[PDB]
Amino acid sequence: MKQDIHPNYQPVVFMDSTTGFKFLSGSTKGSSETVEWEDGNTYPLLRVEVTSDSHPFYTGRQKFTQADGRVDRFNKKYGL
Amino acid sequence: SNGRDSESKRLGAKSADGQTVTGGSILYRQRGTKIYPGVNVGIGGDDTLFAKVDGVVRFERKGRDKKQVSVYPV
Amino acid sequence: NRLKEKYIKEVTPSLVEKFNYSSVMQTPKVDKIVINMGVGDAVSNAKNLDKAVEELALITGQKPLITKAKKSIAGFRLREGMPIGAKVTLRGERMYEFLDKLVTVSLPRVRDFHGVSKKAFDGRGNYTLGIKEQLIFPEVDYDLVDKVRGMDIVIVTTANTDEESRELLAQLGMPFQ
Amino acid sequence: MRVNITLECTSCKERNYLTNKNKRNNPDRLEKQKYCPRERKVTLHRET
Amino acid sequence: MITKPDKNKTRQKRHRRVRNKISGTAECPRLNIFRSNKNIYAQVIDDVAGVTLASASALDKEISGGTKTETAAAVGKLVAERAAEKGIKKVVFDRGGYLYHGRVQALAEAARENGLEF
Amino acid sequence: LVPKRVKHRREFRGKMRGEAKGGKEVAFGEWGLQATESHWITNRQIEAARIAMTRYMKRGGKVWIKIFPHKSYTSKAIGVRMGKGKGAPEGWVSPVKRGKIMFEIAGVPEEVAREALRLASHKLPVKTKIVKRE
Amino acid sequence: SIYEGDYYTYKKKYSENQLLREKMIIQQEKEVKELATFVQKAKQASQTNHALKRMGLERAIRLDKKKKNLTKRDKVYKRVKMDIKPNREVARTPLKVENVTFHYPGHPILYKDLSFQISGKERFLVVGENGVGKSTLLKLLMGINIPDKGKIIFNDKTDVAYYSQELEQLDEEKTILENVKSDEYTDWKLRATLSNFLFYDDDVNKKVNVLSPGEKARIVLCKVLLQKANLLILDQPTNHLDPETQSIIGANFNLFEGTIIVVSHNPSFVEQIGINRMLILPSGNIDNYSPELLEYYSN
RNA sequence: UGAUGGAGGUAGAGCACUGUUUGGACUAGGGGCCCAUCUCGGGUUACCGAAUUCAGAUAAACUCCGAAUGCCAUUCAUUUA
RNA sequence: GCGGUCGCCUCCUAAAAGGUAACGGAGGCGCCCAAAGGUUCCCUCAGAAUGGUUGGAAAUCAUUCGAAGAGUGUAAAGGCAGAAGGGAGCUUGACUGCGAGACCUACAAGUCGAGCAGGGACGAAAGUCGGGCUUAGUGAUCCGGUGGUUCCGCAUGGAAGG
RNA sequence: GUGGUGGCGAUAGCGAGAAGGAUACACCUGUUCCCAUGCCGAACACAGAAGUUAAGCUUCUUAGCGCCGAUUGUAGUGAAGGGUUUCCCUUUGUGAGAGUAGGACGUCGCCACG
RNA sequence: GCGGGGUGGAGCAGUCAGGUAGCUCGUCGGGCUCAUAACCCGAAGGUCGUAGGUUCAAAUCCUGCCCCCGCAACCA
RNA sequence: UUCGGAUUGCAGGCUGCAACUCGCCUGCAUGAAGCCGGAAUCGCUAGUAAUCGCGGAUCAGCACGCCGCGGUGAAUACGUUC
Ligand SMILES: Nc1ncnc2c1ncn2[C@@H]1O[C@H](COP(=O)(O)OP(=O)(O)OP(=O)(O)O)[C@@H](O)[C@H]1O
Ligand SMILES: [K+]
Ligand SMILES: [K+]
Ligand SMILES: [K+]
Ligand SMILES: [K+]
Ligand SMILES: [K+]
Ligand SMILES: [K+]
Ligand SMILES: [K+]
Ligand SMILES: [K+]
Ligand SMILES: [K+]
Ligand SMILES: [Mg+2]
Ligand SMILES: [Mg+2]
Ligand SMILES: [Mg+2]
Ligand SMILES: [Mg+2]
Ligand SMILES: [Mg+2]
Ligand SMILES: [Mg+2]
Ligand SMILES: [Mg+2]
Ligand SMILES: [Mg+2]
Ligand SMILES: [Mg+2]
Ligand SMILES: [Mg+2]
Ligand SMILES: [Mg+2]
Ligand SMILES: [Mg+2]
Ligand SMILES: [Mg+2]
Ligand SMILES: [Zn+2]
């Protein structure tokens, strides 16, 4: 890689906030927070709310209710 | 309107195969390299093939479908 | 390095088993990743391409090569050599790192993300994903974008068949529909 | 606009060479390292 | 699916163009160089006769071995002195389509120092 | 019949000697009309012959026109002296050399075919003969 | 050309000469058209009309000799075209200056508790004499000078364009096109405006270091125009400009639909702009504009 | 005149390129008909049909080919001048 | 007579060397390039299919298929993919004095040229370079202008003028 | 047997299939080093030897394509003649293209390791 | 064959000499009027015949093509 | 825009046999044009204009209209040429 022409790159850890699952990868962005890491090495830490494990599709279960049908709505409203 | 034409350039071969020629004799006038310069033959600025040394002229085939001129001193 | 680790450990033996490879050399691998951002707006204003290039560099970690129109096209007001479109090539560690980031972070942040296409294959074992909008990558900062844009990521592998390609991408993690 | 021009040797003020240049493409006086026969060595020749 | 062209074939494509103006004669033989991942080979060839006058390589067992660069230097020294024994002084260096940068450069400089004229 | 395009507006008259290079055998039709002489044939003559043949056939069967009038011939108007360049292209012809199968017909009984070809031949300038597919 | 007399005499003599030259070219064109018209009449006549065909060729010879001695009218030098329009709209309070005091370190205070407020689409003249603080005040507004005391507030609706007095906004090393380069304008857009400022074709690749002060002033003005700001802080804009370009500048500013803070020692330019309020220095006096400007100058 | 060696693209022929061109197969595609129209998807004329393919022609300014002749030359041969 | 044409380049006519006419059939030239030249190194096209945000027949990207169906400043022919096409670095050989010998040719001209010397560019070296893939892009003499010059200088030294 | 390196018109090619790595050649491991990418150690460059014949490569099978191609006949044609002369015919010499019989999945050297 | 022209509905500019599509009448809507005309206020209407080149950029410059108009197309 | 409150979604309240065509009203959600208006044109001379509500007739329900009531409460009239 040519020198002084590429955006700064630094290794960084990632923790899924919702579940805590951890994965180490490089990125351009830097996080003031830093955490240790196996092999006894510290890296800036980027907390992410949603990851592959967190995302419902990967797990195989979906949170969404999928809404209600109008027949059922009518019965609920009118007690029928 | 037609009626124009340039002077003919008297191209073609100027020396026969098996003919003895002196150094620098023009062997073949051409546009582009219809024939290639072989041994002891140079190609001029405008594709003219000339003998670099004295000898006998020889036209051979350069491979499958290309020709070549060589000058062999005796 | 996580994705390379995952590949070599789990993915490689699993593909070997499924596809009955005589030697591990036959194992398909992600050969390279080419991220291409076609910017026709540069003709109207070159700074659109400039900012697009900057965003792409932030996303990729490598300065992009600014590809140029090989042919002048009056239809798009395009003159030959006009610097429209950029690309970046990632191999080895950078390739694996970017791919893992795409799987984990950039993909979820897509609006109403229903997964990735499962037919966008050339027919030779090489895939492409069309990202409609940026701001899904953490490095875009959701504000620096003056004009939102998209891109095309081309994953070129050593697989001969879309089937082996599909399994490999799934193993590395690909939200196929 | 392409025009004929003369390259004069700076060392001896000798107008050794004739050439031509496009004024628009080369507004400034052309300068070349050319052999000066009078001085028998390479010198800077500038258009005049 | 992606193909990686055979590096040797690409080398040969460049080597043909090199040979279009480099060729060997009895009194000015061609010094042909071949380079592999492991070893490097030098030959002195008379194309007119189509015979290799002298040869050296990292397999001669007269080369102690070492870093591939210095092995090339030893091959160059060995071929230069062998060519001198056969009375060859001037040669034309065929870089075999490689770049005159590294192992080949070391080998060529070794040949120059040990007495081949080129 | 007229070619859609021509590389050159004006063309040499040419010379017709010997047998036709190709097309001397019946290809598609059951019956064919073979030229026994060499002559120019105009698009008008081709068209007249074709119409006569088809009318007699009652739109029964198929008709192939083997020849096409590629060549163009020019002329000079009355009262114009020699010189001052070639004339403007006047018409289109097909140089037909003896042995060429000008027309073919199929899908019709033999006697109808022979009569149809006879009418077409009378329209054409060359002497002709009927040829059966082999 | 050298004339005897004054500027008006030169204009009178010059205007007459170009008038007399123009009439000469008109009559030479008429004679050429007359011959041309007859040549055409012969050209389209029947080939059987031998005499007319003969006369047509004879007149064709005269026509050729005329067309070869036909003086070319010199292309009249093109004048500048300015169309300054604001992108956004002015507010009732574009600029707020309140109790602003400033002094250059080591020198007397130029003004104390200076407080004024512009109204919007107003022609505001900063009057004064040489070395009184006029340019300092304008530098103060832009932010070049930080006020020693007080505050300067720009409404969020106010976009500002600055024309410095000494032409300090140009890179002498770069070219004309490079100087005017902006992120908001494409190349052909820049060229069209530079042509409106009399920079034609490869005249835009010239280094700014070789231009005259007047030509540089046009580049600075072009930068001001390309901003499309609604507030114009102009410090002696007509300086270095030829008299024709000055009137164009003043006339176009008069029609400008925005606020103008201007400094000018040229009486003609201020009249064209039609000043509304004048601020006298060093004695701070926000006043309605009038021929009373002369009274302040006298006093 | 013979023997030998050459340069060249004509006659002829050929379709390998470029034009011109016929019929068949298939068909992207285009045409109007109705359903559905948010004009969305059909299903249609043995509707018109590019490209491909099969078969068949054609050429001074086409050639995968290619003569007879003529031409250049040979320390050549015979005869001649 | 009217119209057309007048010099130069390319093709067909032209009859397989060369040459070969017509108010025969087609087109081009009166330049352009400071790189679009030299050299060292490096690269290979056009299209088609498949996939792919904006994006559409067709912008950029990827694989495969692809021998040239592309490109070669500019007409055509010849030639070029061992490049003459394309890219990069350095450069100015788009050199000075010539030039055995050839082609063309009524003359005047025109064309090609190894090689020798002077002094260089590139390259490690070999070696290439006296413009550009080749063939148009031009005009005799007289007369005059500019620059150089160890030439002459009407008794001599200058000058005037050659 | 393999690797370098050449000569000869592809009868040396292409396509398809099969076998091999002992050495050798390659893929192949890396980027600290010279050196590099109009981004990328992909390439070039360098360092190095964990694995694999998977590919390249080598050897072998195949006539599918491409290539070479006799004889016979014919077109044309030099020469000498004729006719009813835009053409056609005869004698003599020459003789294609096409279409085929067939040929052919190379051959001739040198070096180095076996 | 020689010329002249293709710019909003009509008549015209612009074009030479590249940067920004106008003038007169008309049309549409609304005013004024008892109503119409005139008059007043707003609005629409062309990417310049068309296809290609040149240029950073074309109504403008270059080439072709298609339309429309006048003329000519043969003389003792 | 904490202006503006159109349009729209959902959920309700009534009246009525029945509120889709086609009622009024409520809550939440949404948040339109609109930045004081060209030519022209209208009302008004004092408790008037302006502005603020309240009641009523019709009427199951339904008014920005109509009729009426009160609250606050101005500017200007030189003058009769048009
Ligand atoms: N950077 C400075 N440093 C020190 N003193 C300064 C500086 N700038 C200006 N001064 C002083 O400020 C005083 C007025 O400043 P300013 O430049 O505004 O004059 P002015 O109003 O522009 O006069 P004019 O434009 O007519 O010449 C001058 O006397 C000057 O000497
Ligand atoms: K007949
Ligand atoms: K063909
Ligand atoms: K021919
Ligand atoms: K170069
Ligand atoms: K490697
Ligand atoms: K293998
Ligand atoms: K074979
Ligand atoms: K209702
Ligand atoms: K009510
Ligand atoms: Mg010629
Ligand atoms: Mg040349
Ligand atoms: Mg000042
Ligand atoms: Mg023929
Ligand atoms: Mg000839
Ligand atoms: Mg001949
Ligand atoms: Mg070139
Ligand atoms: Mg004297
Ligand atoms: Mg005297
Ligand atoms: Mg044969
Ligand atoms: Mg407001
Ligand atoms: Mg009253
Ligand atoms: Mg009241
Ligand atoms: Zn000098």
Set of chain G residues whose Cβ sits within 8 Å of the Cβ of C46: 186
In the three-class reduction of DSSP (H, G, I as helix; E, B as strand; rest coil), residue F67 is classed as coil
Could you give the CA distance from residue C51 to residue G82 in angstroms, rounded to a whole number? 31
DSSP H/E element including A43: strand A41-48
Cα distance between residue G14 and residue G11, in whole Å: 5
SS3 G24: helix
| Structure-block tokens of residue F4 | 């859609």
Report the C-alpha gap between F12 and F4 in whole angstroms.
19
Which residues' Cβ are closer than 6 Å to ligand 1? Answer: G 104, 107, 128, 130-136, 165
Helix axes C162-172, C12-19, angle to 10 degrees: 150
What is the rounded CA–CA span in Å between residue G276 and residue G75? Answer: 40
Torsion of CA A8, A9, A13, A19, to 10 degrees: 80
The secondary structure of residue F86, as a DSSP letter, is P
> Are A30 and A44 spatial neighbours (Cβ–Cβ below 8 Å)?
yes
Tokens of F11: 């063309």
- G274 CB-side CA count, 13 A: 10
Look at the block and give the residue holding tokens 């043909």: E16
Are A23 and C100 contacting, i.e. CB atoms less than 8 angstroms apart? yes
Distance in angstroms (rounded) separating the CA atoms of residues G294 and C120 = 80
Dihedral sign for Cα E56, E57, E60, E61, please.
positive
Q: Residue C19, Cα to own-chain centre: how many angstroms? A: 25
- Residues of C with CB below 8 A from E3's CB? none
**What tokens were used for C25?**
């050399």
Cβ proximity of G189 and G246 under 8 Å: no
Asked whether the CA dihedral G63, G68, G71, G74 is positive or negative, the reply is: positive
Q: Distance between CA D30 and CA D27 in Å, rounded?
A: 8
D35 CA distance to ligand 24 centroid (A)?
8
> A50 to chain C: which residues are within 8 Å by CB?
108-109
Query: What is d(CA G269, CA G264) in angstroms, rounded to the nearest whole number?
Result: 7
* Rounded CA separation C28/C46 (Å): 40
| Alpha-carbon Rg for chain C in angstroms | 18
Q: How is residue G118 annotated by DSSP? A: -
Burial of C156 (0-12, 13-18, 19+ CB in 10 A): buried
Task: Fill in the DSSP letter of residue G202.
Answer: G
Give φ, ψ of D15 to 5 degrees: -90, 75
What is the rounded distance in angstroms from the CA atom of residue A19 to the CA atom of residue C61? 28
Q: Are A71 and A39 in contact (CB under 8 A)?
A: no
Q: Let me know: does E109 contact E80? Beta carbons within 8 Å.
A: no
Cα gap B5→C141, rounded to integer Å = 72
> Are A14 and C105 spatial neighbours (Cβ–Cβ below 8 Å)?
yes
Cβ(G252)–Cβ(G206) below 8 Å: no
* Cβ contact F53:F114 at 8 Å: no
Give G127's contacts (C-beta < 8 A, 6+ positions apart): G134, G278, G279, G280, G281, G293, G296, G297
- C-alpha G80: how far from chain center: 6
Here the tokens at position G236 are 């002696």
**Pairing mode, strands A34-37 and B20-21:** unpaired
Q: Name the 3-class secondary structure at E22.
A: coil
Residue minimizing CA distance to atom 19 of ligand 1 = G131
- Structure tokens given for G22: 């123009």
Q: Which residues contact E27 (CB under 8 A, 6 or more apart)?
A: E90
- Residue G180's SS3 state is helix
Angle at G14 between CA G9 and CA G16, to 5 degrees: 100
CA of D5 and C1' of I137: distance in angstroms?
Answer: 18
3-state secondary structure of G75: coil
G282 Cβ contact partners less than 8 Å away, ≥ 6 residues apart:
G110, G111, G128, G132, G133
* Residues whose CB falls within 8 Å of the CB of residue E94, separated by 6 or more in sequence, listed in order: E15, E18, E19, E22, E24, E30, E31, E32, E33
Whole-angstrom distance, CA of residue A55 vs CA of residue A61: 9
Q: d(Cα D6, Cα D15) in Å, to the nearest integer?
A: 6
Residue at B67: amino acid letter: K
Token pair for E89 = 């002084």
Cis ω for the linkage preceding G282 (within 30 of 0) = yes
Contacts of residue G263, defined as CB under 8 A and 6 or more positions apart, other chains included, come to G125, G126, G128, G134, G135, G138, G165, G234, G235, G236
Nearest Cα residue in chain C from A23: C2
Contacts 24+ apart (CB under 8 A), G165-171: G165/G135, G165/G235, G165/G236, G165/G239, G165/G263, G167/G213, G167/G216, G167/G217, G167/G220, G167/G240, G169/G220, G169/G223, G170/G208, G170/G216, G170/G219, G170/G220, G171/G208
Distance, CA of C175 to CA of C112 (rounded, Å): 13
Alpha-carbon distance values, E9 to C131, E1, E2, E14, E115 (Å)? 39, 20, 17, 9, 32
- Of F40, F48, F128, give the one whose Cα is nearest residue F92: F40
Residue F18, phi-psi category: left (phi > 0), alpha (psi -120 to 50), beta (remainder)? left
Closest-CA residue to G281 (of G174, G157, G125): G125
Neighbours of G221 (CB within 10 A): 21
Q: Please count the residues of chain E.
A: 118
* Identity of the amino acid at D19: T
**Specified resolution (Å):** 2.9
> In 3D, which of F134, F95, F131 has the Cα closest to residue F113?
F131
> What radius of gyration do chain A's Cα atoms show?
22
C72 vs G: CB within 8 A: no
Q: How far apart are CA C90 and CA E115, in angstroms?
A: 47
Distance of CA E3 to the CA centre of its chain: 29
Are C120 and C175 in contact, with CB atoms under 8 Å apart? no
Give the determination technique. cryo-EM
Cα–Cα nearest to G195, from G81, G86, G71 = G81
Pairwise CA distance, residues G197 & G211, whole Å: 13
Alpha-carbon torsion (F61, F67, F68, F69), positive or negative: negative
Contact indicator for B57, B69 with CB cutoff of 8 Å: yes
Which DSSP string do the residues of E27-90 spell out, in sequence order? TB-EEEEEE-SS-EEEEEEETTTTEEEEEEETTSSSS---SHHHHHHHHHHHHHHHHHHTT--B
Closest alpha carbon to B53 in B28, B27, B22:
B22
CA at D40, C1' at I151: how many angstroms apart? 23
Residues C110, C172: contact at Cβ < 8 Å? no
Instruction: For chain C, give the secondary structure using H, E and C.
Output: CHHHHHHHHHHHHHHHHHHCCCCHHHCCCEEEEEEEECCHHHHCCHHHHHHHHHHHHHHHCCCCEECCCCCCECCCCECCCCCCCEEEEECHHHHHHHHHHHHHHHCCCCCCCCCECCCCECCCCEEEEEECCCCCCHHHCCCCCCCCCCEEEEEEECCCCHHHHHHHHHHHCCCEC
DSSP state of G197: T
Distances (CA, A) of G116 to G121, G133, G139, G292: 15, 15, 16, 20
Collect all residues with Cβ–Cβ distance below 8 Å to G21 and sequence separation of at least 6. Answer: G71, G73
Tallying the residues shown for chain G, one arrives at 299
Give the span between the Cα atoms of C46 and C81, in whole angstroms.
13
Q: Are strands D15-22 and D2-9 parallel, antiparallel or unpaired?
A: antiparallel
**G183 has a chain C CB within 8 A of its CB:** yes
The C-alpha atoms of residue E111 and residue E96 are separated, in whole angstroms, by: 16
> In the structure, do chain A and chain E come into contact, i.e. share 3 or more CB pairs under 8 Å?
no
Token pair of B42 as six digits: 């140079």
| Distance from C-alpha of A52 to C-alpha of A59, rounded to nearest angstrom | 8
The DSSP secondary structure of B9-72, one letter per residue, reads ---EESS-TT-EE-TT-EEEE-SS-SEEE-TTEEE-TTS-EEESSSEEEEEEE-SSS-EEEEEE
Distance of CA F3 to the CA centre of its chain: 14
For residue F2, the Cα-to-chain-centroid distance in whole angstroms is 12
Q: Is A3 within 8 Å of A17 (Cβ atoms)?
A: no
d(CA G160, CA C67): 38
| DSSP 8-state class, residue G209 | G
Residue G88 in contact with residue G231, Cβ under 8 Å? Answer: no
Contact predicate A36/A67, CB 8 Å: no
Residues of E in contact with C124 (CB under 8 A): 1
B62 touches strand J (CB under 7 A): no
Closest C1' nucleotide to A76's CA: L11
Q: Chain C contact for A79, CB < 8 A?
A: no
| DSSP state, residue G205 | G
**Chain A residue closest to C88 (CA)?**
A6
Taken as a whole, chain C contains a residue count of: 177
Cα F129 from Cα G4, distance rounded (Å)? 106
Nearest CA owner, ligand 1 atom 16: G133
User: Minimal Cα–Cα distance from E2 to chain C, Å?
Assistant: 6
* Residues 26-65 in A contacting C (C-alpha not used; CB under 8 Å): 26-29, 46, 48, 50-52, 54-55, 57-58
- What is the H or E stretch that residue G33 is in? helix G7-43
Nearest atom of ligand 1 to the alpha carbon of G106: 4
C32/E contact by beta carbon, under 8 A = yes
Q: Which two tokens stand for residue G6?
A: 């004054």
Residue from G196, G194, G212, G214 nearest G204 by CA: G194
**Which positions on strand I lie below 7 Å from a protein C-beta?**
1-14, 17-20, 22-28, 31-34, 41-44, 46-47, 49-65, 77-80, 82-84, 91-97, 100-105, 111-114, 118-120, 123-127, 130-135, 147-148
- Alpha carbon C6 to chain centroid distance? 19
Furthest-apart CA atoms within chain E: distance in Å? 53
What is the rounded distance in angstroms from the CA atom of residue C158 to the CA atom of residue C19? 14
Three-state DSSP at G285 gives strand
DSSP G248-274: HHHHHHHT-SSEEEEE-S-HHHHHHHT
* Spatial CA neighbour of C32 closest among C86, C87, C108: C87
User: How many Cβ atoms are within 10 Å of B53's Cβ, its own excluded?
Assistant: 14
**Torsion over CA: E19, E22, E26, E28 (sign):** negative
Angle (CA) G244-G246-G247 rounded to 5° is: 70
The 10 Å Cβ neighbour count of residue C137 is 23
Structure tokens at G110: 């130029």
Measured between CB atoms, which of C94, C138, C175 is closest to A57? Answer: C175
Q: Across chain D, which distance is largest between two alpha carbons, in Å?
A: 33
What one-character DSSP code corresponds to residue D14?
-
Whole-number Å distance between alpha carbons of G217 and G167: 7
Taking CB atoms and an 8 Å limit, are G184 and C45 in contact across chains? yes
Asked if D6 contacts D23 with a C-beta cutoff of 8 angstroms, the reply is: no
C-alpha to C-alpha distance for A42 and A45, rounded to whole angstroms: 9
Pair of tokens at residue G166: 């000494």
For residues A17 and A9, the answer to whether their CB atoms sit within 8 Å is no
Beta bridge partners of G160: G231
Q: Bridge partners of F103?
A: F33, F65
Helix axes E68-85, E103-114, angle to 10 degrees: 30
Helix (H) or strand (E) holding A70: helix A70-78
Q: What is the 3-state secondary structure (H, E, C) of F95-113?
A: EECCCCEEEEEECCCHHHH
All residues at 6 or more sequence positions from C48 whose CB lies less than 8 Å from its CB, including other chains: C39, C41, C42, C147
Angstrom distances, CA of residue C174 to CA of C14, C100, C118: 16, 10, 9
Residue type, E60: D
Query: Is any atom of nucleic acid chain J found less than 7 Å from the CB of residue E85?
Result: no
Using DSSP, state whether E20 is helix, strand or coil. coil
CA distance E118 to F12: 65
- How many Cβ atoms are within 10 Å of C48's Cβ, its own excluded? 19
**Token couple for D44:** 């800077």
Identity at F76, one-letter amino acid code: K
| G214 touches G177 (CB < 8 A) | no
**Listed residue (G271, G284, G287, G222) closest to G98, CA to CA:** G284
Q: Does C125 touch chain E (CB under 8 A)?
A: yes
**Pairing of the two strands F31-35 and E40-46:** unpaired
Please name the chains neighbouring B, where neighbouring means 3+ C-beta pairs under 8 angstroms: none
List bases, strand L, within 7 Å of protein CB.
Answer: 11-12
**Sole residue written with tokens 């050209």:** G43
